[PDB]
């Protein structure tokens, strides 16, 4: 028995085993677009991706992750509000059994059908254990997905989650370019908040890219055919595997546009 996306064991019981489930700064948050302030001081994201090297993908339950190899600074993210040098170090997604919802975070109380999501950890730290107990320890890219046109750069993704089908499989991913799963615009909104998933730890700078991709409703559909279970027991589809917003309180959203 543990925590899950489940009506016994939902995000609305996480915090019976973990606290700080009702701390501060949680994510995710409904952007308000009009409260937002533009930040003149904000500089523009610098994604170096150039050389990612990409490992593996695994299901581990709760989503499906991209490992990528970040024992050197090989795929980094600079700029923005951030302050140092953070290595990618996985990537995964959210969403939902419809595409009316999905997303963690909300534009506007907006749901998309998905959310991508790059985590990066703060250099500085030596390794992303030690970064996740610091207050500036990670800094997650989110992207938002809607239903429309197909996108080529995600279908090496999708053509692989049959051989990662239930929970503890993994595969060879290699030579996978994060690049291809970017919008034409790099303009966003910032917040101090944490991470989506149990233990749920405060130590993320979020930065929420303006522009959405679209993906084709057959790509979202093989999401959908993803196993919360492991192999020889009853199956359960990873579906709705989101986060509902959580209360703002002392902080402020700030967006690198006008
Ligand atoms: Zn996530």
């Known amino acids: 028995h543990h925590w899950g996306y489940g009506k016994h064991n939902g995000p609305e019981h996480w915090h019976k085993d973990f606290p700080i489930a009702k701390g501060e700064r949680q994510s995710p948050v409904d952007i308000d677009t009009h409260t937002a302030k533009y930040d003149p001081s904000l500089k523009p994201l610098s994604v170096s991706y150039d050389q990612a090297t990409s490992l593996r993908i695994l299901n581990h339950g709760h989503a499906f992750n991209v490992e990528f190899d970040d024992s050197q600074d090989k795929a980094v993210l600079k700029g923005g509000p951030l302050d140092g040098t953070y ?39 030596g390794d992303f254990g030690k970064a996740v107990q610091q207050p500036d320890g990670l800094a997650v890219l989110g992207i938002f ?24 499989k993994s595969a060879d991913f290699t030579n996978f370019d994060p690049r291809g799963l970017l919008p034409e615009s790099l303009d966003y909104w910032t917040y101090p908040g944490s991470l989506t998933t149990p233990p749920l730890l405060e130590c993320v700078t979020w930065i929420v890219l303006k522009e959405p991709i679209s993906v084709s409703s057959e790509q979202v559909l093989k999401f959908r055919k993803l196993n919360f279970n492991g192999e020889g027991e009853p199956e359960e589809l990873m579906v709705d595997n989101w986060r509902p917003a959580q209360p703002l309180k002392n902080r402020q959203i700030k967006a690198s546009f006008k």
């Open 87 to 125: 290595r990618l170090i996985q990537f995964h997604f959210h969403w939902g059994s419809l595409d009316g919802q999905g997303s963690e975070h909300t534009v506007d109380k907006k749901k998309y059908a998905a959310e991508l999501h790059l985590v990066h950890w703060n250099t500085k730290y």
């Open 145 to 168: 997905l809607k239903v429309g046109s197909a996108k080529p750069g995600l279908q090496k993704v999708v053509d692989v989650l049959d051989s990662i089908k239930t929970k503890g």
